[PDB]
Amino acid sequence: ADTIVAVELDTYPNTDIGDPSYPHIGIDIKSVRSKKTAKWNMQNGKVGTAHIIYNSVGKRLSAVVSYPNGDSATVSYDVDLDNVLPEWVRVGLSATTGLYKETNTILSWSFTSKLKSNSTHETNALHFMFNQFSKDQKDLILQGDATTGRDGNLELTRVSSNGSPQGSSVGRALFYAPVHIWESSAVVASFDATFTFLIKSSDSHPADGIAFFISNIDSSIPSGSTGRLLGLFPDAN
Amino acid sequence: ADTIVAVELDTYPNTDIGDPSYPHIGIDIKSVRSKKTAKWNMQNGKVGTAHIIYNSVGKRLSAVVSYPNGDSATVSYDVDLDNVLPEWVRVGLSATTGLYKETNTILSWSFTSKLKSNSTHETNALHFMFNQFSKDQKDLILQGDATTGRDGNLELTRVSSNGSPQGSSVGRALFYAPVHIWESSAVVASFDATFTFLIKSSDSHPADGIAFFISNIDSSIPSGSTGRLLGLFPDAN
Amino acid sequence: ADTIVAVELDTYPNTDIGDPSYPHIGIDIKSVRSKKTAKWNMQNGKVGTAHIIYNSVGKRLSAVVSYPNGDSATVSYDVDLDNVLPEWVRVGLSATTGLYKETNTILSWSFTSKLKSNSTHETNALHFMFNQFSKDQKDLILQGDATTGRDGNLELTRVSSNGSPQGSSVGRALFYAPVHIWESSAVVASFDATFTFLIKSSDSHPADGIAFFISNIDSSIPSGSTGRLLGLFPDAN
Amino acid sequence: ADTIVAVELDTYPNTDIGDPSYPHIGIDIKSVRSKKTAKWNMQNGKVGTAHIIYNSVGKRLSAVVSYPNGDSATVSYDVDLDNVLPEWVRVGLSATTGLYKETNTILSWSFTSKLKSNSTHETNALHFMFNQFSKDQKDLILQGDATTGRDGNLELTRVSSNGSPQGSSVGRALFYAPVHIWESSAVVASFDATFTFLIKSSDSHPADGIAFFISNIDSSIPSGSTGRLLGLFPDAN
Numbered sequence: 001a002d003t004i005v006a007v008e009l010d011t012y013p014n015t016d017i018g019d020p021s022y023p024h025i026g027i028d029i030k031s032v033r034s035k036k037t038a039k040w041n042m043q044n045g046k047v048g049t050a051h052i053i054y055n056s057v058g059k060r061l062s063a064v065v066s067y068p069n070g071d072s073a074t075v076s077y078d079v080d081l082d083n084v085l086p087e088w089v090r091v092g093l094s095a096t097t098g099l100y101k102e103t104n105t106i107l108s109w110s111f112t113s114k115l116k117s118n119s120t121h122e123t124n125a126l127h128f129m130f131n132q133f134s135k136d137q138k139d140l141i142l143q144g145d146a147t148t149g150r151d152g153n154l155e156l157t158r159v160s161s162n163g164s165p166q167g168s169s170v171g172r173a174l175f176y177a178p179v180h181i182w183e184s185s186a187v188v189a190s191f192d193a194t195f196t197f198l199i200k201s202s203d204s205h206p207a208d209g210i211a212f213f214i215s216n217i218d219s220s221i222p223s224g225s226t227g228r229l230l231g232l233f234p235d236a237n
Numbered sequence: 238a239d240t241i242v243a244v245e246l247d248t249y250p251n252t253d254i255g256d257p258s259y260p261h262i263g264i265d266i267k268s269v270r271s272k273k274t275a276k277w278n279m280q281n282g283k284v285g286t287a288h289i290i291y292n293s294v295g296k297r298l299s300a301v302v303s304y305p306n307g308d309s310a311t312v313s314y315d316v317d318l319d320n321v322l323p324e325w326v327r328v329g330l331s332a333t334t335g336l337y338k339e340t341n342t343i344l345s346w347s348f349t350s351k352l353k354s355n356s357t358h359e360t361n362a363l364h365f366m367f368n369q370f371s372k373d374q375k376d377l378i379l380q381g382d383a384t385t386g387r388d389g390n391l392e393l394t395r396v397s398s399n400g401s402p403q404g405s406s407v408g409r410a411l412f413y414a415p416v417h418i419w420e421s422s423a424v425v426a427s428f429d430a431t432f433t434f435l436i437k438s439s440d441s442h443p444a445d446g447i448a449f450f451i452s453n454i455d456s457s458i459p460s461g462s463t464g465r466l467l468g469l470f471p472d473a474n
Numbered sequence: 475a476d477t478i479v480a481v482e483l484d485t486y487p488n489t490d491i492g493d494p495s496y497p498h499i500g501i502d503i504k505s506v507r508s509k510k511t512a513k514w515n516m517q518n519g520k521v522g523t524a525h526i527i528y529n530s531v532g533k534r535l536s537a538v539v540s541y542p543n544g545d546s547a548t549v550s551y552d553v554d555l556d557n558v559l560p561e562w563v564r565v566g567l568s569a570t571t572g573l574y575k576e577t578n579t580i581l582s583w584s585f586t587s588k589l590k591s592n593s594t595h596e597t598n599a600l601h602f603m604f605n606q607f608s609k610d611q612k613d614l615i616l617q618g619d620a621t622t623g624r625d626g627n628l629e630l631t632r633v634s635s636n637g638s639p640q641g642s643s644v645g646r647a648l649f650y651a652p653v654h655i656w657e658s659s660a661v662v663a664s665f666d667a668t669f670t671f672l673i674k675s676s677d678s679h680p681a682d683g684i685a686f687f688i689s690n691i692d693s694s695i696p697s698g699s700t701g702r703l704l705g706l707f708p709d710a711n
Numbered sequence: 712a713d714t715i716v717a718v719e720l721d722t723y724p725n726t727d728i729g730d731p732s733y734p735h736i737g738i739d740i741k742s743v744r745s746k747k748t749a750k751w752n753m754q755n756g757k758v759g760t761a762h763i764i765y766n767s768v769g770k771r772l773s774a775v776v777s778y779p780n781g782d783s784a785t786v787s788y789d790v791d792l793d794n795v796l797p798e799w800v801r802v803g804l805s806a807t808t809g810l811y812k813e814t815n816t817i818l819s820w821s822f823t824s825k826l827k828s829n830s831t832h833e834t835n836a837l838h839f840m841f842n843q844f845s846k847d848q849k850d851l852i853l854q855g856d857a858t859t860g861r862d863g864n865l866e867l868t869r870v871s872s873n874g875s876p877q878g879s880s881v882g883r884a885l886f887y888a889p890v891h892i893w894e895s896s897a898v899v900a901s902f903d904a905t906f907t908f909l910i911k912s913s914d915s916h917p918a919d920g921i922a923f924f925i926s927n928i929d930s931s932i933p934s935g936s937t938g939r940l941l942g943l944f945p946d947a948n
């Protein structure tokens with residue numbers, strides 16, 4: 001029973017399991033069936049940027065995805081995350097391919113967590129930033145088909161020598177250190193995440209997508225969670 | 238006239254202008270009559286901390302004030318600030334006394350602003366932090382009775398040689414540089430503010446309060462804005 | 475008479491004023507005749523990056539300029555800057571051309587200053603970052619030929635309509651707010667600066683260079699400081 | 712055999728292994744016999760602060776230790792750390808007692824590291840800050856006697872229920888995630904570290920001290936490294 005909170009860049013509409021009929025960004029609370037979605041125009045071969053924002057005061061998880069184009073999709077969801085997540089978590093990126101496929105290439109990833117207590121001027125904080133991924137990235141936990149180093153990029157799902165994506169692939173990268181996501185005595189608990197991605201496909205349809213996620217610290221890829229399950233959920237319920 | 242967005246720590250109930258009948262924190266949008274308030278237990282002689290948070294994605298302005306004993310008050314309000322504030326602003330702190338009085342001592346003040354544009358990896362950012370103020374604080378514009386240096390603090394309103402606060406006082410401190418609070422090509426426009434404060438009084442009722450505010454770059458203390466107007470507004474409409 | 479400390483990216487050797495006979499980077503303390511230089515291979519048309527570092531403990535002003543190549547040049551100079559600079563300063567970038575010319579385009583600029591006092595914790599900080607420059611950049615003070623907005627860049631020296639640089643040009647940009655660069659009570663005072671630049675020329679000899687500098691707050695371009703004087707110094711003493 | 716770089720706050724002069732005949736701060740490169748020391752007027756039972764700065768461009772490691780009254784000791788040493796440390800390291804704090812003893816209490820600890828490659832605008836960074844340590848601090852690896860939670864502090868060496876230090880104790884805390892401290896392509900590989908500590912003793916002479924250190928990721932407490940070896944070294948060579 002892993003616990004997952006995620007923001008999904010979902011490139012392939014699985015209408016049989018509640019996806020909207022178009023590519024979309026979604027906020028997933030413990031389920032692949034997003035609590036909230038917004039229409040997303042995925043630009044093939046373009047570098048996209050995703051921003052994830054949350055604070056325990058406003059209690060609103062917000063995401064926005066944009067392209068140099070200026071086009072962007074935004075989704076927000078009201079939720080008290082310390083009611084959902086355990087006190088300590090790991091943070092990661094996940095992606096899959098299914099019958100259809102795409103590259104799930106991460107060019108950068110940054111994260112910041114802060115816990116500001118009632119004790120005057122006392123903050124715990126964690127911040128990391130990857131603008132380059134080397135072949136042996138020791139501060140990343142790689143699961144499934146994820147690899148690092150290729151062009152200083154992070155490839156979440158399987159890519160061939162020529163740079164062609166493979167189907168039925170799943171990969172995740174988690175930051176090595178546990179993250180203290182909330183604390184009972186913190187007046188403000190907040191976090192921000194940003195990553196840049198390149199999704200390209202020669203298919204009639206790209207699949208299946210990329211997600212930023214927060215999980216219990218021992219989280220691993222659920223069995224058979226390629227394709228529509230985005231490497232996050234054990235079932236589609 | 239000035240355009241003001243503010244978070245007020247209001248120590249004195251002026252019920253005839255919409256104040257609730259108790260000390261309170263409020264979010265002010267272009268008026269002294271808060272769009273949203275919350276009951277605040279002001280702790281005389283104790284050091285309090287205010288946190289203000291906003292991002293352009295969730296479009297929710299939040300503030301929490303707390304003391305070391307864990308007592309706190311929180312208020313949130315949904316608003317798109319790019320429809321309220323001009324593109325360039327100055328940020329500041331303001332405080333007043335009236336018939337009744339209190340010290341309006343600031344012990345620290347920090348602010349962070351970020352404009353993340355659609356251009357990949359293109360962020361503009363401003364951040365400052367004061368944990369002490371000196372007698373000649375050149376990066377602060379002091380207006381009214383505000384002074385710096387007294388015990389490394391910032392005294393917003395007038396205080397006598399022995400520490401006794403004066404009545405009918407108003408003072409403000411604004412950060413020297415203009416701040417680019419929003420932009421059209423910005424996918425994210427967030428800001429955070431924090432300050433710590435010491436409000437003490439020997440009156441039966443302390444007055445009138447402290448506020449963090451955001452105004453047009455040429456903002457000045459409106460005529461007659463002492464006491465209940467918190468040095469921010471020309472009138473109580 | 476201004477007080478100037480600067481790191482020069484000197485593209486044109488003026489041997490009659492103490493320059494080495496090759497393009498170079500140098501540390502200038504109150505004089506255009508560098509206290510220290512190192513040979514620098516400027517790459518026409520490439521985006522370069524300059525990093526400037528200093529702290530009041532090691533007391534070594536250090537600079538490094540690099541290209542994606544990545545060839546790079548480094549220069550360091552042992553000096554106590556709080557013996558040179560005034561307590562409050564402004565920071566800026568400057569560039570010139572003379573009989574020979576080049577573009578002096580700034581693509582980004584960030585700066586961080588910190589004063590850490592003896593009082594446990596208690597830090598004063600200032601940080602800004604520009605990754606794009608709009609036509610009306612209110613938090614910059616532009617001097618001479620300097621303009622902002624052209625492709626979201628900062629052009630320090632004159633550029634014709636077609637993108638060709640003009641000769642005998644001088645321009646500077648300074649951050650709007652005064653910076654508290656040293657303080658007597660501070661145990662650690664440090665600053666860090668970064669900028670990316672694009673110098674391109676069609677001349678047989680590109681000239682004259684770019685500099686990051688720290689000066690007295692009311693610093694302006696000295697008369698006749700184009701070309702070899704880099705807009706920083708009134709003469710070559 | 713571990714590789715150690717360290718800044719020691721040495722409270723007990725072990726003159727037989729090269730210690731100066733007074734409490735001192737030192738920079739240790741692979742040896743308990745400091746490459747550089749400075750006299751340190753240690754203040755029993757007072758809260759002190761250590762700042763550590765590595766300037767990778769200047770190749771200069773510096774440390775300053777101070778108390779609220781302003782008294783400070785400083786030490787600098789020239790070294791290029793990519794010649795000493797492996798590419799990946801862990802960072803941590805260490806402390807010991809021997810025949811003589813002292814509390815080795817850590818009240819706060821922050822660390823910031825930055826690898827800036829030659830690829831334009833590509834910076835990897837890690838930052839963490841602890842202003843309080845909980846009883847279950849999942850992002851720290853505790854070794855030997857080190858414990859967390861007591862008054863929100865980190866106790867590196869054994870302390871009794873009534874706050875009295877024990878002799879012949881050794882304990883270390885390492886940040887969980889491996890740190891990429893240098894890389895071939897990196898033009899800048901600097902870091903800063905800060906911690907606040909409380910050393911108290913009823914002994915005539917407190918011993919043995921506290922160190923901030925950097926080591927190979929699999930570093931553990933060397934056999935019989937209590938007392939003068941500060942839990943860092945296997946012997947006094």
Ligand SMILES: CO[C@H]1O[C@H](CO)[C@@H](O[C@H]2O[C@H](CO)[C@@H](O)[C@H](O)[C@@H]2O)[C@H](O)[C@@H]1O
Binds near residue numbers: 098101207
């Ligand atoms: C209806 O079932 C068929 O078609 C499905 C596609 O709609 C296909 O789903 C696979 O591929 C999709 C896209 O990659 C992925 O989302 C699913 O998880 C699954 O792997 C079915 O396999 C059938 O062909």
Ligand SMILES: CO[C@H]1O[C@H](CO)[C@@H](O[C@H]2O[C@H](CO)[C@@H](O)[C@H](O)[C@@H]2O)[C@H](O)[C@@H]1O
Binds near residue numbers: 464
């Ligand atoms: C008509 O109200 C009388 O009493 C008021 C106080 O309740 C007083 O208000 C003054 O003082 C308050 C508190 O300092 C301040 O909020 C007002 O703006 C004003 O300065 C009125 O003046 C009357 O005496």
Ligand SMILES: CO[C@H]1O[C@H](CO)[C@@H](O[C@H]2O[C@H](CO)[C@@H](O)[C@H](O)[C@@H]2O)[C@H](O)[C@@H]1O
Binds near residue numbers: 575700
């Ligand atoms: C006397 O030297 C002659 O040639 C010099 C270099 O061509 C020239 O210097 C001008 O241009 C250089 C390079 O742009 C600049 O550094 C000087 O400040 C000056 O403007 C002299 O003027 C002579 O022509």
Ligand SMILES: CO[C@H]1O[C@H](CO)[C@@H](O[C@H]2O[C@H](CO)[C@@H](O)[C@H](O)[C@@H]2O)[C@H](O)[C@@H]1O
Binds near residue numbers: 919937
């Ligand atoms: C000379 O050797 C004796 O005295 C030594 C120090 O006085 C003592 O060293 C022990 O205690 C010190 C201080 O705690 C510590 O630095 C050593 O590592 C060792 O633990 C010797 O044991 C002798 O008594």
Ligand SMILES: [Ca+2]
Binds near residue numbers: 010012013019208228
């Ligand atoms: Ca889907």
Ligand SMILES: [Ca+2]
Binds near residue numbers: 247248250251
């Ligand atoms: Ca009021």
Ligand SMILES: [Ca+2]
Binds near residue numbers: 484
């Ligand atoms: Ca020259």
Ligand SMILES: [Ca+2]
Binds near residue numbers: 723724730
């Ligand atoms: Ca010793």
Ligand SMILES: [Cl-]
Binds near residue numbers: 529533766769773
């Ligand atoms: Cl240094």
Ligand SMILES: [Cl-]
Binds near residue numbers: 791
């Ligand atoms: Cl060396």
Ligand SMILES: [Mn+2]
Binds near residue numbers: 019026032034
């Ligand atoms: Mn979906």
Ligand SMILES: [Mn+2]
Binds near residue numbers: 256261271
């Ligand atoms: Mn009110």
Ligand SMILES: [Mn+2]
Binds near residue numbers: 484494500
């Ligand atoms: Mn020169």
Ligand SMILES: [Mn+2]
Binds near residue numbers: 721737745
């Ligand atoms: Mn020693």
